[PDB]
Design a protein around this ligand. Structure first.
Ligand SMILES: [Ca+2]
Ligand SMILES: [Ca+2]
Ligand SMILES: [Ca+2]
Lengths: 614, 614, 614
């Protein structure tokens, strides 16, 4: 070999694959319009009549099938695919239209053929053509296909369910994106989520891998506050080059653009034919709305209770595919994620995909009790609600003096609790400094101790005396807030908290820990209507009604129930200027004003939470 | 904005840069043969008559100038560039010929025009054409250029020094690759370094970013042992596709291929014209030979002591560009890396690059004492050696019964210490499991406590009684080993160790800690000649002589001096089969045999280390 | 208040107790012979007809009832007492005779009235007199008592069971000290345990709190090796002042002194009257022999299977009273300790102690499967043994070339595997440096990855190929070692190991992890008799038979089964000098000699482990 022989030959370096216990095949599958989608198929060596598990993703199919470069399939594929490797399944990941190895144009959460999409293709037809090709060209398969995926990967499963290929025998949409305005990714009750600015450049900058937005500093509390409004931050970052950004600001309210994209409404008029398991985390910080709302839209038509299932674990977004033994300071009884994957998911998929496999005794509802630390196998959910459930909700009244109880307010006390909300000094949603990039912070923010803001003058705290008997809730709490603002707009944040016993000697850090079981924010301008915003009348007590995330939680003896109320949750949510403007995205510096907020706790105007007690 | 408007546009997304305090400018510089090299220039805004600091790298110039996407130049550039940002320098990184954005073919450490390179270009001409272009095309510059870089980036500096452009006013080769066979990257005294297998696929798989090699498991001790020889592992990993791998196995001995690449020999015949500062770490685990040998090759001709400098800090490879406050369990007196960059490097560069800058009080030698924890400013180095230095070396004799002293062996005792070296059960160079991916393990292996192998039957341990007075060494120890093997080949590993006081109450983990101050391996087949290997005569005591890494270390009172001897250091070094084979890279399973080793400690055949005491 | 008024008044400072939810009373209960024992009684406020849980301890009753100075009983008492606080029990801790607040003389594990104790009192009579006083003087109780305790606190429960007071309705000896010579605290098959030297000064220096032994250095590997024999270390430390030390060295063999103290032999002749639950950890590093052997001594007479229970969790010594969610690098399915305490222990105690309490569904055997990670509820144990069990044991033969399989050795291979055992360089039982005071090291040593010694020339390794199907063992493995030694004595250490799959991508550190499922040491001089030691015939293959710790473990697919054999386990066990001496405690420097060890693996003399497969 000559010394001047180029050490980089130019020809592709073929990695070793002799010792592999799998085969990886990449193929460009033509859709009905000629556009080919990059599809990666991983088969166990010696696979015969094996089912296929398919996932359609905008997060790199080649990368999703290489958690680690390894000759062992169990290590090659992600942690969440462990049960599929153990079951001898063929795993397939496909790049959606317009991303990574696939051809075509990319449209964020490409809408269904209809009012928003006049083309001949969408995610439903793309999944159909994909499945058709797989059962006709993968000789190692038995022609049976199951679909699974979390977040955007769950959204593609839902799209396939709108009109599924006959070969699709089972589906598991995990934390799917269903309604990005009401309560999933983009907004929550109209309040815009700034955490997704990095997602926009990360997914829309290039066909393939993108990047986050360069910051002025480390603390996002400071980065966003200094920039001003959400529109100011975006403009300075160059986001006006992205059509998606223009779509968000042109549709700030819940108009036809968002209504026509709500997939739970679509599931309501979609016939039940494919056994589907709606899954999400109880602390799903990205898609809290999706799974539970989609499950409820189809459950009334699940006549025999064997086609529509619900799964809600003690998980943060997508934790179902990793280790569910803990979340932040909370410890659970074993790896709850692995428990779900092995005890419930595997037998459910085997029943519909593996030849000769027995029927599984899949629980209609598989939900974790975050207070008692154990799974619950039920026939229905919720167990308690205002009407139609086994148990009836009980009003939990906010009381004067920062108290909280099931007894209606008595006369002869202060009619309300007051606090000033200052947009220039907003309440932080997590301890400063805030780093949206820090995955540890973002995935655990919903279970973080709230004492870092308890005692702030712009946060109201209501608490019960220590419980002597366990209080079990099992449903979706509903806020019935009676509040006024001296401004003409305002956000209202309510947190339902489990305060641990003041002392916890066996785990000292948990002593007095304020765990948010369920919390939400509501953009006040949408009080009467989500599609048609209106200014709030200054200094007038008004009724605000909105649901808090689902909870299957027992407040144990020694614990207290607590409710915190505030008017900002920054920088996760852009600040409500507190003066009515046409579009908060483009609020001007002078529009931001302090406002005197009042939460009423009188017999005539009682604030309370309809708690799903059982 | 229509809903179907592609969210990923035809016109690429461009990040905003209005708040930037620098300007990044890319250029394609044509070399003399027409090949263009991708060059990245980072200028402070308002830069005028500013000096340039240039680095030529095979590690992505665009990546090297983006430690963090940020509007602040200090954060955008690497930690090691802090003093250049503070000094208002224009920073330039260039992709070497055949890598990343550059055109041309890539040849690993492209040799100088000569016997190994018949072309008209090499790193010397490329650096010359680059500097000529920069001074004629960067209007913001004062036409003065300084070069710096660590490892391969240091190697490109040395290549420029063979025939430097008149505009090159100063050079700082940090841990440069000088002799990859004698003691730098590829081999150490002929013993092959398996840690670089991942580097081959990482740098030679493609023009741009490559990847590591997929392992069968987590523990490299097991991965390499199970594979067999280095050639078996490489063959299985698909490395026979890389011409570099064939160059290594075709030139296992120190033949013309390696002799013609030794840059210290080139420096010996290179006139001293550009002020040069040779730098490396005392614990440089990748390029231990380079800087010190190159410095010594030029120092005798440094008439006024102002053209050739030496710097040796308490660092691992490239730590000079990060934080030097500690290394593994060792704590030093402040951030020694920052101290060097600010107190020595900055004034040195300024003196020769900034118009009208003052004279720097640059110490001819800047070397850290790892035993007293402070820098030493000296006029010469070494301070002690066999002859020609201020102090003279003293033999430190290995003794029977595992003893060690400066007194020659006495009669009436065992003439040797014996151990069996078994290739099937080699001595680990770091505690198992060995993870070559774990950067923390690799960067700190040389300072790791050796108690994890002390007490093994295949490792001999010689130790003094606790010292009552400080023992200072300041030079390069030289091993004079008298040893026999029952086989026909063998490796000899010698570690000079500082054993800390048995108790260290203020830092308990340091109690009895066995810190290797200096260690080296020698491949026995090269005992008589590095170019002509010969079998070792079975059962015959033979003299081996080889140098240990430089040390400026004071063994303090309460400490002991220790020497460990073994015949494997795995998996860092491939195993010597202990039977004489033509090429150890291709040793067969049956070639590996146990061997009875004897280290002689008698008056007639005394093993000792020539210690550079002062 | 005058400025010169002494700030320390001299009168006792009464801590506030108004807010306490408990009442703490201290009383000196007179025994049969007039000697009063300090007893601490903790009653919940408003206690009426409450049962008592009693523990007798030599570890400070006042300290045991104050985990934290707190007004909440749950936090005041230890973590393990959580279920008793929840159950409204009165908790009592009593200082044993001669310790802390109690009067009388202290005798280590004071033997029962008989040949070793001619006095009128022992732990049985002391417990009787205590229980009698409690039911007659504690008006807040219902006159029913349960006993519990771990280690020495479990030993006092067993002493009460030899002749229990009628008021004792239930007992739970946890990791009790049963046979301190055969396999509990002082020795293991005659091999002396040096870890207890600190225990001797800690418990025998003073009536109250003692201290450990001052060391020369940090590393006990070095401290003990430098001192020489166990006797040399003890003499230098001043331990000849302690009668206990003289008792140990005067009874090095299993003579009448130890036979008369073996409580499992006493339980074999003790009528089953009190529902007893024998408990220990599978990795009980202090009392591995006790619970399982005592359970087996009484189970044949448990006619209705309702008076004798067994519990073996995935625990280290006493972990049952803390958090059992993990042990070292091992993760279990939830807090297994809390699971046992709440799901099994609480209902078991309530049934026999609380008025009108319901029947508990107590599993006859509650044993954790360390390979499948789940509890097993069985009617009997073991599930597999040589004869009389549901399954029969299968021989796992050690093979030449470091192999292992269920197939008998074939001819034509090497008849044995050889290694030299050097007492001057013993095999470490845990990575150096060894610190017996480091609780983290000591509690997790039995589950530590054994790769730190795998590959040592003085440790033999035998391993199977990767398993394709699960291999479940459920019983006590029995070693049938055929081995010789060139010396006249030797220790034999055997480890049964579960080697995790080479790669574990979801938990990288577990890749190739060598987990010791079960290990034991056997002092060779007791090959034919534990009471009468005899020299081993030099170079003659001899049969060694001894049991390994119980295992309920499934070696899963991908894992390998491994067996390691060595002749030292230092410094936990003193070194066998390898030349026969009358008493190893007083071995002289010249008695320690290297010895050539041979483990036979031929068809004629096959070494194997009788594995309890099912
Ligand atoms: Ca259903
Ligand atoms: Ca000089
Ligand atoms: Ca029983």
């Amino acid at each position: 070999t000559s010394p001047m022989t180029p050490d980089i030959t130019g020809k592709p370096f073929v990695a070793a694959d002799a010792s592999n216990d799998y085969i990886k095949r990449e193929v460009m599958i033509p859709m009905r319009d000629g556009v080919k989608l990059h599809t990666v198929i991983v088969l166990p060596k010696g696979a015969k009549n094996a089912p296929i598990v398919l996932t359609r993703t905008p997060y790199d199919a080649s990368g999703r099938t290489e958690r680690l470069a390894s000759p062992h399939m169990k290590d090659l594929l992600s942690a969440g695919d462990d049960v599929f490797v153990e079951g001898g399944y063929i795993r397939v990941f496909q790049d959606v239209r317009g991303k990574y190895g696939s051809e075509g144009d990319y449209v964020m959460t490409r809408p269904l053929r209809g009012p928003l999409n006049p083309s001949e293709v969408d995610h439903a037809t793309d999944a159909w053509d994909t499945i058709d090709w797989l059962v006709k060209n993968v000789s190692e398969s038995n022609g049976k296909v199951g679909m699974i995926g979390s977040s955007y990967e769950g959204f593609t499963v839902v799209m396939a369910l709108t009109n599924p290929h006959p070969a699709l025998k089972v589906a598991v949409p995990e934390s799917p994106m269903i309604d990005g305005w009401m309560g999933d990714d983009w907004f929550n009750y109209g309040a815009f989520r700034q955490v997704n600015f990095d997602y926009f450049t990360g997914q829309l900058s290039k066909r393939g891998k993108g990047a986050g937005i360069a910051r002025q500093g480390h603390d996002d509390y400071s980065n966003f506050l200094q920039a001003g409004s959400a529109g100011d931050f975006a403009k300075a970052a160059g986001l006006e080059q992205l059509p998606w950004w223009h779509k968000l600001t042109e549709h700030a309210a819940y108009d036809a653009f968002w209504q026509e994209q709500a997939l739970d409404k679509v599931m309501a008029r979609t016939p039940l034919k494919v056994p589907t398991m709606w899954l999400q985390g109880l602390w799903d910080q990205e898609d809290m709305w999706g799974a539970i709302h989609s499950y409820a839209a189809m459950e009334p038509r699940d006549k025999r209770n064997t086609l529509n299932y619900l799964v809600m674990g003690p998980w943060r977004h997508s934790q179902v595919n990793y280790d569910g033994s803990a979340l932040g300071a909370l410890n659970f009884e074993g790896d709850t994620a692995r428990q779900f994957r092995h005890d419930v998911l595997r037998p459910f998929f085997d029943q519909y995909l593996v030849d000769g496999a027995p029927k599984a005794d899949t629980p209609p509802v598989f939900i974790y009790n975050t207070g008692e630390n154990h799974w619950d196998r039920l026939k229905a959910w919720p167990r308690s609600c205002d009407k139609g459930c086994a148990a009836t909700s009980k009003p939990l009244y906010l009381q004067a003096g920062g108290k909280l109880s099931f007894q209606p307010p008595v006369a002869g006390q202060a009619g309300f609790e007051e606090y000033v909300s200052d947009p220039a000094k907003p309440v932080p949603f997590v301890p400063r400094p805030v780093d949206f990039a820090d995955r540890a912070m973002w995935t655990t923010w919903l279970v973080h101790d709230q004492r870092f803001v308890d005692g702030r003058p712009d946060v109201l705290t209501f608490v019960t005396e220590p419980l002597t008997e366990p209080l079990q809730i099992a449903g979706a709490p509903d806020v019935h807030l009676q509040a006024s603002t001296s401004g003409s707009d305002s956000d209202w944040v309510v947190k339902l908290i489990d305060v641990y016993p003041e002392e916890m000697a066996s785990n000292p850090k948990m002593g007095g820990y304020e765990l948010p079981v369920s919390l939400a924010i509501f953009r006040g301008r949408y009080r009467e209507s989500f599609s048609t915003p209106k200014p709030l009348t200054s200094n007038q007590p008004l009724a605000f009604q909105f649901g808090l995330p689902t909870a299957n939680h027992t407040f144990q003896p020694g614990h207290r129930v607590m409710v915190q109320v505030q008017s900002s949750l920054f920088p996760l949510y852009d600040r409500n200027p507190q003066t009515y403007v046409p579009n908060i995205f483009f609020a001007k510096p002078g529009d931001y004003q302090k406002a005197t907020q009042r939460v009423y706790v009188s017999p005539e105007q009682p604030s309370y939470i309809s708690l799903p007690v059982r």
